[PDB]
Design an enzyme around this catalytic site. Structure first.
Site, mmCIF file in Angstrom:
data_model
loop_
_atom_site.group_PDB
_atom_site.id
_atom_site.type_symbol
_atom_site.label_atom_id
_atom_site.label_comp_id
_atom_site.label_asym_id
_atom_site.label_seq_id
_atom_site.Cartn_x
_atom_site.Cartn_y
_atom_site.Cartn_z
ATOM 1 N N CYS A 109 52.909 -78.342 -7.525
ATOM 2 C CA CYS A 109 53.610 -77.171 -8.034
ATOM 3 C C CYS A 109 55.043 -77.552 -8.391
ATOM 4 O O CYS A 109 55.817 -77.986 -7.528
ATOM 5 C CB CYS A 109 53.580 -76.031 -7.012
ATOM 6 S SG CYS A 109 54.525 -74.572 -7.544
ATOM 7 N N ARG A 112 58.433 -75.049 -6.878
ATOM 8 C CA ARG A 112 58.676 -74.928 -5.446
ATOM 9 C C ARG A 112 60.140 -74.781 -5.055
ATOM 10 O O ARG A 112 60.402 -74.596 -3.862
ATOM 11 C CB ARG A 112 58.109 -76.141 -4.725
ATOM 12 C CG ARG A 112 56.621 -76.119 -4.614
ATOM 13 C CD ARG A 112 56.165 -77.366 -3.890
ATOM 14 N NE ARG A 112 56.127 -78.520 -4.785
ATOM 15 C CZ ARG A 112 56.053 -79.779 -4.368
ATOM 16 N NH1 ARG A 112 56.030 -80.039 -3.071
ATOM 17 N NH2 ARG A 112 55.998 -80.778 -5.246
ATOM 18 N N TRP A 281 55.725 -66.577 -11.592
ATOM 19 C CA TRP A 281 55.971 -66.264 -12.986
ATOM 20 C C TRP A 281 55.673 -67.520 -13.784
ATOM 21 O O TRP A 281 55.650 -68.624 -13.243
ATOM 22 C CB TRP A 281 57.404 -65.781 -13.212
ATOM 23 C CG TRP A 281 58.438 -66.746 -12.701
ATOM 24 C CD1 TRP A 281 58.852 -67.907 -13.308
ATOM 25 C CD2 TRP A 281 59.200 -66.632 -11.495
ATOM 26 N NE1 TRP A 281 59.818 -68.518 -12.547
ATOM 27 C CE2 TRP A 281 60.058 -67.757 -11.434
ATOM 28 C CE3 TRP A 281 59.252 -65.686 -10.463
ATOM 29 C CZ2 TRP A 281 60.943 -67.967 -10.382
ATOM 30 C CZ3 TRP A 281 60.150 -65.886 -9.412
ATOM 31 C CH2 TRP A 281 60.980 -67.020 -9.380
ATOM 32 N N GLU A 286 52.191 -73.236 -19.656
ATOM 33 C CA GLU A 286 50.936 -72.776 -19.069
ATOM 34 C C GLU A 286 50.199 -71.848 -20.022
ATOM 35 O O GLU A 286 48.972 -71.911 -20.131
ATOM 36 C CB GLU A 286 51.195 -72.071 -17.740
ATOM 37 C CG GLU A 286 51.783 -72.953 -16.665
ATOM 38 C CD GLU A 286 52.016 -72.190 -15.374
ATOM 39 O OE1 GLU A 286 51.079 -72.158 -14.551
ATOM 40 O OE2 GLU A 286 53.121 -71.610 -15.197
HETATM 41 C C1 HEM Z 1 57.427 -68.891 -9.056
HETATM 42 C C2 HEM Z 1 57.058 -69.523 -10.170
HETATM 43 C C3 HEM Z 1 55.983 -70.628 -10.187
HETATM 44 C C4 HEM Z 1 55.835 -71.490 -11.191
HETATM 45 C C5 HEM Z 1 56.674 -71.591 -12.491
HETATM 46 C C6 HEM Z 1 54.741 -72.354 -10.867
HETATM 47 C C7 HEM Z 1 54.305 -73.382 -11.671
HETATM 48 C C8 HEM Z 1 53.180 -74.122 -11.421
HETATM 49 C C9 HEM Z 1 52.498 -74.988 -12.361
HETATM 50 C C10 HEM Z 1 52.910 -75.221 -13.834
HETATM 51 C C11 HEM Z 1 51.463 -75.537 -11.732
HETATM 52 C C12 HEM Z 1 50.481 -76.521 -12.391
HETATM 53 C C13 HEM Z 1 49.067 -75.995 -12.203
HETATM 54 C C14 HEM Z 1 48.416 -75.762 -13.538
HETATM 55 O O1 HEM Z 1 48.898 -76.315 -14.560
HETATM 56 O O2 HEM Z 1 47.401 -75.025 -13.560
HETATM 57 C C15 HEM Z 1 51.437 -75.029 -10.359
HETATM 58 C C16 HEM Z 1 50.551 -75.345 -9.348
HETATM 59 C C17 HEM Z 1 50.449 -74.745 -8.106
HETATM 60 N N1 HEM Z 1 51.248 -73.726 -7.616
HETATM 61 FE FE1 HEM Z 1 52.966 -73.142 -8.502
HETATM 62 N N2 HEM Z 1 54.230 -71.987 -9.640
HETATM 63 C C18 HEM Z 1 54.968 -70.911 -9.186
HETATM 64 C C19 HEM Z 1 54.752 -70.223 -8.008
HETATM 65 C C20 HEM Z 1 53.844 -70.507 -7.018
HETATM 66 C C21 HEM Z 1 53.617 -69.739 -5.792
HETATM 67 C C22 HEM Z 1 54.342 -68.413 -5.408
HETATM 68 C C23 HEM Z 1 52.659 -70.382 -5.100
HETATM 69 C C24 HEM Z 1 52.013 -70.056 -3.734
HETATM 70 C C25 HEM Z 1 52.576 -69.255 -2.830
HETATM 71 C C26 HEM Z 1 52.278 -71.558 -5.857
HETATM 72 C C27 HEM Z 1 51.321 -72.463 -5.484
HETATM 73 C C28 HEM Z 1 50.810 -73.427 -6.333
HETATM 74 C C29 HEM Z 1 49.709 -74.306 -6.022
HETATM 75 C C30 HEM Z 1 48.878 -74.346 -4.719
HETATM 76 C C31 HEM Z 1 49.497 -75.083 -7.063
HETATM 77 C C32 HEM Z 1 48.387 -76.157 -7.084
HETATM 78 C C33 HEM Z 1 47.241 -75.588 -7.893
HETATM 79 C C34 HEM Z 1 46.151 -76.613 -7.968
HETATM 80 O O3 HEM Z 1 46.132 -77.584 -7.154
HETATM 81 O O4 HEM Z 1 45.269 -76.448 -8.855
HETATM 82 N N3 HEM Z 1 53.008 -71.601 -7.018
HETATM 83 N N4 HEM Z 1 52.507 -74.164 -10.221
HETATM 84 C C1 LIG Z 2 51.647 -68.573 -8.838
HETATM 85 C C2 LIG Z 2 51.587 -69.480 -10.036
HETATM 86 C C3 LIG Z 2 50.627 -70.485 -10.113
HETATM 87 C C4 LIG Z 2 50.586 -71.288 -11.238
HETATM 88 C C5 LIG Z 2 49.578 -72.406 -11.361
HETATM 89 C C6 LIG Z 2 48.179 -71.909 -11.668
HETATM 90 C C7 LIG Z 2 48.088 -71.382 -13.087
HETATM 91 C C8 LIG Z 2 48.011 -72.227 -14.202
HETATM 92 C C9 LIG Z 2 47.915 -71.684 -15.480
HETATM 93 C C10 LIG Z 2 47.832 -72.524 -16.738
HETATM 94 C C11 LIG Z 2 47.202 -73.881 -16.486
HETATM 95 N N1 LIG Z 2 45.729 -73.888 -16.618
HETATM 96 C C12 LIG Z 2 45.121 -72.572 -16.898
HETATM 97 C C13 LIG Z 2 45.373 -74.811 -17.705
HETATM 98 C C14 LIG Z 2 47.898 -70.309 -15.627
HETATM 99 C C15 LIG Z 2 47.967 -69.473 -14.524
HETATM 100 F F1 LIG Z 2 47.944 -68.141 -14.697
HETATM 101 C C16 LIG Z 2 48.063 -70.013 -13.258
HETATM 102 F F2 LIG Z 2 48.137 -69.206 -12.187
HETATM 103 N N2 LIG Z 2 51.484 -71.081 -12.219
HETATM 104 C C17 LIG Z 2 52.429 -70.120 -12.130
HETATM 105 N N3 LIG Z 2 53.321 -69.957 -13.149
HETATM 106 N N4 LIG Z 2 52.471 -69.315 -11.037
#
Ligand code: HEM
Ligand SMILES: Cc1cc(CCc2cc(CCN(C)C)cc(F)c2F)nc(N)n1
Ligand code: HEM
Ligand SMILES: Cc1cc(CCc2cc(CCN(C)C)cc(F)c2F)nc(N)n1
Ligand SMILES: C[C@H](O)[C@H](O)[C@H]1CNc2nc(N)[nH]c(=O)c2N1
Ligand SMILES: C[C@H](O)[C@H](O)[C@H]1CNc2nc(N)[nH]c(=O)c2N1
Ligand SMILES: [Zn+2]
Lengths: 411, 416
Positions: A109, A112, A281, A286
Site C-alpha cells: 500500500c 500508508r 480515497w 487506479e
Molecule cells: C487512504 C488512501 C489510500 C490509498 C491512496 C491507497 C492506495 C493503494 C494502492 C494504489 C494500492 C495498490 C493495490 C492495487 O493497485 O490494487 C493499495 C493496496 C493496499 N491497500 Fe492501500 N490505499 C489507501 C488506503 C488504505 C486503507 C485505509 C487500507 C486498510 C485499512 C489499505 C490497505 C491496503 C492493502 C491491504 C493493500 C494490499 C492489497 C493487496 O494486497 O491486493 N489502504 N493501496
Molecule cells: C482502501 C483503498 C485500497 C486501494 C487498493 C485496492 C484497490 C485498487 C483499485 C485499482 C487497482 N486494480 C483494480 C487494478 C481500485 C480500488 F477501488 C481498490 F480498492 N486503493 C485505494 N485508493 N484505497
C-alpha cells in the site's frame, strides 16, 4: 543482520532492523525470488496463545507499558479465555491498534502515510445480514463525507469454526456490474462478470447499463448471503470530463468516488476477521490506468485515441501512451473539480517516500513491495522507482481469502 | 524445493509450469522471511581454487554436451578428462571455441533482467583470448563496434578477452559502456553533458584526456590489459553512429540540439562460464526506446529535459496533477523512436519488446522448462500496465553461464 536500502536518485541510505521481528514467510527462498507472484503459497488453542501473546506484548510495548500490571493481567486474562472457550475477544483499544497496524504493515500500500488516521468501526455485535447492511451504509456515509473522504474500516465478528463466517461477497463495496453479451463481448466492467451473474442468479434485476452499481451480497454467521441496494444518495459518483477536450464528456464515462476493499481478511493476535471492509480515497491511476485501460477491464484506449485522431497503425507512435496520459488527466481533473478527494501518483509516491523516512526513523523499517508501490504509468519519473525496498510480512496484517462462492455450502 | 512452480498471466489466464528453477546454482539474496527483489546488487586476488573449479567445470561441460545431444559420449568423457587434467596441472583450463560460443549465448539467455532475450541464439561471438595489450584490445573493440553497428542495421555481438588468472592480470574495460557521453561538473554546481558520467569523465581527464567540454562528447576508451595500468584510446568518430533527435509534429524539437548514439554496448560486466571469469567481455545489442527517452533524458540525475520540453509544450507546470511530466515524457519517447526509424537505425519500442519477451518466455517454458525473469527490470519505466509483462508473473533465479556485476576497476587496481 542490519539491512541497508538505498535510493539511487538521492543516494539516501536507510538501515532496516524491523525485518528481524517478522516470522511469517514471503514465498521466496535463497534460490528463487517470487516477488512478482500475486499470491505465493481455523486455528487450535495450541497455535492461538503464542499468537495472542505476541500481539498483546507489542500492544503494551506500543503504549510504553510492557511488563506492567495491566500487561500481565491481560496475558493471564487472555490465557483463561483461550482455555475455557478456544478463542478470546479483543478489547476495543486492541482492536483499533490492530487494524491501524494491519494497514501500517501492508507492504503493497502506497497510501500508508495516513495509517494512524484510520476510523475503526467495531461491528462485532452484528448477527444478521440486515445488521451488516446497516453497518456498511454507516461506513459508506461516514467515509464519503460529501466528497471529503476519510479512511475507515468496519470489523464484523471474527471466525469461530469456519462454518459461521461473516463475509461481504462483493470484492469492493461499490463496483459496476459486468454483462457477458450474446455476441461474446462484455458490457460494463468485465472484472465483475462472475459476481454480476451470482447477483442475477440470486434475484437481482439488472438494469443492463454500463455503470450499474452492484447490490451488496451479505453473508452473516455462515448463512446464505442476502441482497441489498445501497441507497443511491450514499454512492458518490464523478462524471469524467477533460480540461481541454470538450468531446471527452461525450464518452459517457463516470466513476465512483469511494474505493472500499471488502474481500480481504484481517488477522490480529491469531484471530481472523473475514469481513472487514475498509476504504480510503483513490490514487488517479487506479481508475484511469487500470480500471479504464486494462485490456481485461473497460479497455477504452482505442476509443480515446480515435477521438484524439492519433495514428494507431503502429505501436511505435506511442498512441496508447498518449491516450493513457489524457485519460488520467481527465480523471484527476474531474475529481478535483467535484471536490472529491483524489491523489495523483506523483504526490502519492512522494508521500510514500516521506513515510518510509519516518518509519525507518521511528520504527526501524517499513515493509514495501516495489512491484506494487511503483505506479502503473510513468514509473521512473516517480521517486519510488529508484527506491530500494525490503519486503517482509509483519502482523497484524490483511490477507487474501478464497472467494465465498467457491466454499459456501448453500442452504 | 517443490518440483514444479506455476506462474500465471493475470490478463490472459495462461499458466506456465517452471521446472528449470531446479537447476539454479547461486543465491538470489532473498530468504524465506525477506524478499530483496528490488535491491539493485543484492577481494580481487581471490580466484577459484582447484577444488572449487573441478565441479563448476564438470557442470558446464555436462550441460554443453547435453545441449549438442552427446551426453555420455566418448567425446564428452574425453573432454571431462582433459579438463580435469588441465585443472590438476595448471589450476585452470581453456574453453574450446564451441564451448565459449555456447557459454556466451547462454549467459545472455540466462540474463533474468534482459527483455531482449528472444534474440539470444543470434549472438555473434568474437574470440579475443589471444589479446595481450591495450592496443590490441582497442583493435578488437573497434572491430566489434563496426560489425555491430553495420551502418544502422545493428547486430548483437560480444567480444571476449582473456580470462582471469591470479586476479592481478585482469583485462578490464574501465568504461561502463563502449560509447557514452562525458559529464562535466562546473564550479557553480551545475553539470554539462551526462551527469551519470561525471566520475568516469574525471578519471579520463586525469589520465590525460583533453576534454572538448561540450554536451555530447564521446568518452575515450580506457583499456586495461594483463593487469597493466589502463590506457586511453579515442574511438574513430566515423565508427560512432549518432541520431539527431527530432519530433514528427513539433518542429521546435530539433532546436533542442539533442542527439544520441545508436549502439548500446555494456562493457563493465563479468562473464562466468564453467567457473572461468572473463572480466572484459563487452556486448552490444540495440536500444529499446525507453532506455534513451525515459532514462537517458528524463531521469532527474541525467539530462533532465522534461522541464525544457514541457516549457516548449506550454504545459501547466505549477501542479503535478496536470501530469505535465507524464505528457512530456511521452513526446520525448515519440521523438526518439521517430528519429531512429527515420535514420534507419535499429530500435524497438517498449510495446513490441515486451510482447516479443512474452512470446520468448512462453517458448522457453515449453522448450526449456522455464525462463528466469526479473519483473522489476523487465517492466518498462513508462506505461508499465499497458504492456503485457506487467500482468505476467515471473520467477527469478540465477542460472550459469551468467553475466555478473564486478567492482569498478579504479577501486581495486594496483597502480604500477
Ligand atoms: C487512504 C488512501 C489510500 C490509498 C491512496 C491507497 C492506495 C493503494 C494502492 C494504489 C494500492 C495498490 C493495490 C492495487 O493497485 O490494487 C493499495 C493496496 C493496499 N491497500 Fe492501500 N490505499 C489507501 C488506503 C488504505 C486503507 C485505509 C487500507 C486498510 C485499512 C489499505 C490497505 C491496503 C492493502 C491491504 C493493500 C494490499 C492489497 C493487496 O494486497 O491486493 N489502504 N493501496
Ligand atoms: C482502501 C483503498 C485500497 C486501494 C487498493 C485496492 C484497490 C485498487 C483499485 C485499482 C487497482 N486494480 C483494480 C487494478 C481500485 C480500488 F477501488 C481498490 F480498492 N486503493 C485505494 N485508493 N484505497
Ligand atoms: C538485442 C537487443 C537488446 C535489447 C533491446 C536489450 C534490452 C535490455 C534492457 C531494456 C535491459 C534493462 C536495461 C536497463 O534498464 O539498464 C537489459 C538488461 C540486460 N541485458 Fe539486454 N538487451 C539487448 C541485448 C543484450 C545482449 C546482446 C546481451 C548480452 C549478450 C544482453 C544482456 C543483458 C544483461 C546482462 C542485462 C542486465 C544488466 C544489468 O543488470 O545492469 N542484452 N537489456
Ligand atoms: C546490450 C544491451 C544492454 C542493455 C542494458 C544495459 C543498458 C542500459 C541503458 C539504460 C541507461 N540506464 C542508466 C538507465 C543504456 C545502455 F546503453 C545499456 F547498454 N540494453 C540494450 N538495449 N542492449
Ligand atoms: C530501486 C530499483 O531496483 C531500481 O530503481 C531499478 C528498478 N528497475 C529498473 N529497471 C530497469 N530496466 N533498469 C533499472 O535501472 C532499474 N532500476
Ligand atoms: C504479475 C504481477 O505481480 C501483477 O500484474 C501485479 C504487478 N503490480 C501491481 N501493482 C499494483 N499496484 N496493483 C496490481 O494489481 C499489480 N499487479
Ligand atoms: Zn524475493
Amino acid at each position: 543482520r542490519f539491512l541497508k536500502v538505498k535510493n539511487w536518485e538521492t543516494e539516501v541510505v536507510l538501515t532496516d532492523t524491523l525485518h528481524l521481528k517478522s516470522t511469517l514467510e514471503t514465498g521466496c527462498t535463497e534460490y528463487i525470488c517470487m516477488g512478482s507472484i500475486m499470491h505465493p503459497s481455523v486455528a487450535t488453542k495450541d497455535q492461538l496463545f503464542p499468537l495472542a501473546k505476541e500481539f498483546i506484548d507489542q500492544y503494551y510495548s506500543s503504549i510504553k507499558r510492557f511488563g506492567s500490571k495491566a500487561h500481565m493481567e491481560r496475558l493471564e486474562e487472555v490465557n483463561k479465555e483461550i482455555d475455557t472457550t478456544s478463542t478470546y475477544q479483543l478489547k476495543d483499544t486492541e482492536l483499533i491498534y490492530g487494524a491501524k497496524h494491519a494497514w501500517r504493515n501492508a507492504s503493497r500500500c502506497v497510501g500508508r502515510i495516513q495509517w494512524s488516521k484510520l476510523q475503526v468501526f467495531d461491528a462485532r455485535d452484528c448477527t444478521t445480514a440486515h445488521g451488516m447492511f446497516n453497518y456498511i451504509c454507516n461506513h459508506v456515509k461516514y467515509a464519503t463525507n460529501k466528497g471529503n473522504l476519510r479512511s475507515a474500516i468496519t470489523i464484523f465478528p471474527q471466525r469461530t469454526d469456519g462454518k459461521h463466517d461473516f463475509r461481504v461477497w462483493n470484492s469492493q463495496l461499490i463496483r459496476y456490474a459486468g454483462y457477458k453479451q450474446p455476441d461474446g463481448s462484455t458490457l460494463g466492467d468485465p472484472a465483475n462478470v462472475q459476481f454480476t451473474e451470482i447477483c442475477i442468479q440470486q434475484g437481482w434485476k439488472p438494469p443492463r447499463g454500463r455503470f450499474d452499481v452492484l447490490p451488496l451480497l451479505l453473508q452473516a454467521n455462515g448463512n446464505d448471503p442476502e441482497l441489498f441496494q445501497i441507497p443511491p444518495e450514499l454512492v458518490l459518483e464523478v462524471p469524467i470530463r477533460h480540461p481541454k477536450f470538450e468531446w471527452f464528456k461525450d464518452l459517457g464515462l463516470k466513476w465512483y468516488g469511494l474505493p472500499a476493499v471488502s474481500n480481504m481478511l484481517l488477522e490480529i493476535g491469531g484471530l481472523e476477521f473475514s469481513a472487514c471492509p475498509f476504504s480510503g480515497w483513490y490514487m488517479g491511476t487506479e481508475i484511469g490506468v487500470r480500471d479504464y485501460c486494462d485490456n481485461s477491464r473497460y479497455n477504452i484506449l482505442e476509443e480515446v485515441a480515435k477521438k484524439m485522431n492519433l495514428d494507431m497503425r503502429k505501436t511505435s507512435s506511442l498512441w496508447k501512451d498518449q491516450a493513457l496520459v489524457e485519460i488520467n488527466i481527465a480523471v484527476l481533473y474531474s475529481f478535483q473539480s467535484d471536490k472529491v478527494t483524489i491523489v495523483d501518483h506523483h504526490s502519492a509516491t512522494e508521500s510514500f517516500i516521506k513515510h518510509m523516512e519516518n518509519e525507518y526513523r521511528c520504527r526501524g523499517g517499513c515493509p514495501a513491495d516495489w512491484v506494487w508501490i511503483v505506479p502503473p504509468m510513468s514509473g521512473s519519473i516517480t521517486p519510488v522507482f529508484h527506491q530500494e525496498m525490503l519486503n517482509y510480512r509483519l502482523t497484524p496484517s490483511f490477507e487474501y481469502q478464497p472467494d465465498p462462492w467457491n466454499t459456501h455450502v448453500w442452504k
